[PDB]
Design a protein around this ligand. Structure first.
Ligand SMILES: COC(=O)c1ccccc1S(=O)(=O)NC(=O)Nc1nc(C)nc(OC)n1
Ligand SMILES: COC(=O)c1ccccc1S(=O)(=O)NC(=O)Nc1nc(C)nc(OC)n1
Lengths: 349, 350
């Protein structure tokens, strides 16, 4: 189950821009400590890893980590079982895994001075934000409160430290520049399928509207819904009657209509309440966010699309967290992804 | 195929680090976003580790440790897309570990809710960062004497400058002790192994070896900081500008320094390091004096009974290497010299 035969593997950087400091560079003057004087800095570039099997069949898969994550989540589970990278190379697909700008091996744009500041210009904010272990525990639905598990949980218990260690902050790079890097990658790859997660859900939808090479999307628990501009439906507040889900992203209808031209599947795990749950903010947030996505998919289908919501419990898989692809039953989750690819001919040459 | 690789297994994991906490208690009924430090536990300073194991490995696993401002990418591929040392050594029948050290790449960057690096009133890392420019890296890496220029003999993959410089970035002010600690923990997990280091990780790998008997050999590509027994640093001249000095050598207690005499150690240097003072080119002159300091460090290990050597790539018949010989155009020939070192010491046999 662990063996993999690669025709080739490697990694590269793509996307990004440059910014420049003031003045000139004199190679005769001390280079350390480093200075912005005469400086060119490459910023906002993305890291890309690829592994290609012998005799690939179908389109390459581009696995795009969720918020605060890296391509690690597709390589291995926290307890060291094979991730989707290995499983899909074994399923005969070329597999690309990225670290988006601002995350992991992607660029974090900072210079000589306060974080993110190039002289007078703020490239990214000096003040950061970052979830705690406790916030991630409830966001990911391991259980209703930190340290508590749902009885049915598929989480690899005992490997909590390993799991939370994979998460971190993201600097305030604009979403436009993140989308731009992935559009450039899709242009480089050719026809492909995006497999997204959480924060990369809305970003992958945007990429597809800019890149006809995206031939399908599977999004694991996307975090932000998308609608045509001016056509956001009524979405309730949370059960606390004060909080809202993430403001839906709005795009011009001419771009939104491109989503109707490819198969799209959103995949949700378990333990999302059907009814308001004021005691558990993130559980209630997932209830309303899932509802908003159901409306987003319906809007795509009213434009002639083929956009579906797969609830893993309906497929017979119980207890999945917000990371179904690293849960204990991730092989069965992968089988459902192979099923989607096969139905839509994305596993054939 | 030159690109074909057969893995018995591959994967990645996190190791090392500690936790820090914010004040107060976490209430799951209160809005979790925007993120707060209240009731928070944060995992900080952990390291990312990737491994690829061949079918039936022969000899010790290799741990490739990137230089300053880099990541494990530099061992995966060259800027122009040729195989890196990860592929070459898996093909050479060694299990290969590649790390992103704490503060770099997939390793943790310790920041929270607040100004960068600050957890309430505690400064975990500095808010003010430092980072080289393209121009600083060009001369540090000896592509040529000035940005845009290449040495006549250059092995750099010319035309792929954008790819190359895009791989570099800043490092937060994590203590070197905590970086060493994470790698010591990895070495405990792996068992007997060989460290292959680069630039900034040179001195760190020497330190790891003094804390971890499982390090059975070191190959260091152009280490940046020299190491000596405490209060035994030899006289080292200032640079030709009569103002600058090399990096202050690291000093360790002699009982730890002596551990370096028990294992084979090779430092590898590329080309275009001047023999004589060069006041017009600061980094070239810096490399001249830094290489000299390393020659004295290796001599101090040998005087204690060690097995330390300096491999100048031009003396081995390889001309034009930069500060990254393992991604240069002749990196296959550089790899053959690493295989030679491993074979000489039996580190390629079980
Ligand atoms: C791994 O799971 C997630 O990606 C994820 C999933 C659900 C909620 C939060 C996150 S996240 O915090 O970690 N990433 C994210 O999308 N956060 C976010 N993004 C935007 C654009 N705005 C706001 O605040 C309004 N928060
Ligand atoms: C890949 O090349 C190198 O690794 C490398 C190579 C040559 C010089 C410098 C570096 S470095 O940029 O990372 N720095 C390093 O080794 N640590 C460090 N950094 C600074 C800024 N100051 C001091 O001490 C004053 N030490």
């Amino acid at each position: 189950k662990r063996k993999v035969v690669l025709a080739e593997q490697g990694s590269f950087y793509i996307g990004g821009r440059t910014v420049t400091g003031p003045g000139k560079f004199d190679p005769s003057k001390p280079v350390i400590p480093y200075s912005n004087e005469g400086a060119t800095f490459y910023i906002n570039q993305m890291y890309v890893n690829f592994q290609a099997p012998v005799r690939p069949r179908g389109l390459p898969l581009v696995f795009w980590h969720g918020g605060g994550l890296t391509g690690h989540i597709w390589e291995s589970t926290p307890d060291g079982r094979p991730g989707f990278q290995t499983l899909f190379v074994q399923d005969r697909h070329t597999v690309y895994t990225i670290d988006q700008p601002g995350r992991g091996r992607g660029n974090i744009p900072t210079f000589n001075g306060p974080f993110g500041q190039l002289e007078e210009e703020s490239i990214v904010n000096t003040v950061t934000g970052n979830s705690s272990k406790e916030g991630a525990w409830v966001r990911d639905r391991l259980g209703p409160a930190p340290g508590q598990f749902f009885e049915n949980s598929q989480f690899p218990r005992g490997y909590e430290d390993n799991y939370f260690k994979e998460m971190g902050f993201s600097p305030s790079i604009s979403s436009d520049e993140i989308v731009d890097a992935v559009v450039k990658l899709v242009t480089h790859i050719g026809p492909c399928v995006l497999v997204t997660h959480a924060a990369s859900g809305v970003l992958g939808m945007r990429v597809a509207t800019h890149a006809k090479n995206v031939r399908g999307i599977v999004a694991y628990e996307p975090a932000t819904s998308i609608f045509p501009k001016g056509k956001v439906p009524e979405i309730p507040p949370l059960a606390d009657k004060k909080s809202q889900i993430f403001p839906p992203f709005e795009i011009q209808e001419s771009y939104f209509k491109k989503l109707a031209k490819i198969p799209i599947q959103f995949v949700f795990g378990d333990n999302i309440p059907k009814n308001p749950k004021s005691a558990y903010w993130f559980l209630d947030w997932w209830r309303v966010t899932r509802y908003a996505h159901s409306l987003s998919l319906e809007a795509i289908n009213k434009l002639g699309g083929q956009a579906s919501l797969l609830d893993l419990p309906t497929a017979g898989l119980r207890g999945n967290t917000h990371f179904p692809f690293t849960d204990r039953n991730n092989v069965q989750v992968a089988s459902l992804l192979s099923d989607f690819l096969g139905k839509h001919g994305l596993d054939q040459n």
